[PDB]
Design a binder for this molecule. Structure first.
Ligand SMILES: NC(=O)N1CCN(c2ccc(F)cc2)CC1
Length: 284
């Protein structure tokens, strides 16, 4: 029974290595990673891989690993797939911990934009969680934390993290993680998966997929939002992704909005993440 070596980048930046039979489905590897992580609330998470075009793909747990990674290495990341709109409702602290690690990467990477004050507040809760109570000993007037807090670090941001850290005396790791999440969850790009596209006139837009629906970023002045309820039907054909929108009360016919994606695989990928989010956020 021939087994393939799998390497998984965990949310703390460390590598987990295991073996699975070469005809294994993605669920087999995912179950092994989740057990390694002592994670029970597995529904929010998944494994990503990079395809032959270097795009991030979700590893489908129901399909053979080999028929997804195809010609590529058996190298994966462990990621949040469905960002809970109310992290306080998760049953375990360890779930909330992994969600925090994902969000810290979302922030440092610039996928999750954040004001100066919110970067420093989020930062201060991570420090409280990881080091415990503020200690003046590990912080002179020239302190810079090992912790990555932001896509661009400034001495002013480092100072503001420390100032807010001082206010969190007595806060336990679970408490600090919950405060982190209560703030992060409110950010306008929280849990938003962004896809480059063109509208039916060839104008460059972004399509965002999240818990509440599909977003269309045309410009800062023009953001259309389709709650899952309003979305009747979704489909892809060639390089195109089409969305059917419910008629308003006492309108006869649905509207179709068509989008052009970079290529057929980018269209299919957007279609599948939409399918997944609708099913998830219709059951949650
Ligand atoms: N198999 C079926 O009978 N349905 C058809 C509609 N479909 C859907 C998917 C995504 C979305 F955004 C809106 C609707 C769910 C599956």
């Amino acid at each position: 029974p021939k087994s393939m070596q799998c390497k998984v980048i965990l949310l703390d930046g460390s590598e987990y290595t295991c073996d699975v039979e070469k005809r294994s489905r993605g669920q087999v590897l995912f179950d092994k990673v989740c057990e390694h992580l002592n994670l029970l609330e597995k529904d929010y998470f998944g494994l990503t891989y990079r395809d032959a075009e270097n795009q991030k793909n979700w590893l489908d747990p129901a399909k053979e690993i080999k028929k997804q990674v195809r010609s590529g290495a058996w190298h994966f990341s462990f990621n949040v797939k469905f960002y809970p709109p109310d992290p306080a409702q998760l049953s375990e602290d360890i779930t909330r911990y992994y969600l925090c690690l994902q969000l810290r990467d979302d922030i440092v990477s610039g996928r999750l934009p954040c004001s100066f004050v919110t970067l420093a507040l989020l930062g201060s809760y991570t420090v409280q969680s990881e080091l415990g109570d503020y200690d003046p000993d590990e912080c002179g007037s020239d302190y810079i934390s090992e912790f990555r807090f932001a896509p661009n670090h400034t001495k002013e941001l480092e100072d503001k993290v420390i100032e807010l850290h001082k206010s969190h005396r007595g806060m336990t790791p679970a408490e600090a993680e919950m405060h982190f999440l209560e703030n992060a969850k409110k950010l306008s790009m929280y849990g938003v998966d962004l896809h480059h596209a063109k509208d039916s006139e060839g104008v460059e837009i972004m399509l965002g997929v999240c818990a509440s629906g599909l977003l269309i970023y045309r410009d800062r002045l023009r953001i259309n939002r389709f709650a899952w309820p309003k979305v009747l039907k979704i489909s892809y054909k060639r390089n195109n992704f089409y969305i059917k929108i419910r008629p308003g009360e006492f309108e006869q016919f649905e509207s179709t909005i068509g989008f052009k994606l970079p290529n057929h695989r980018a269209a299919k990928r957007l279609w599948k993440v939409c399918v997944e989010h609708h099913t998830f956020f219709r059951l949650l």
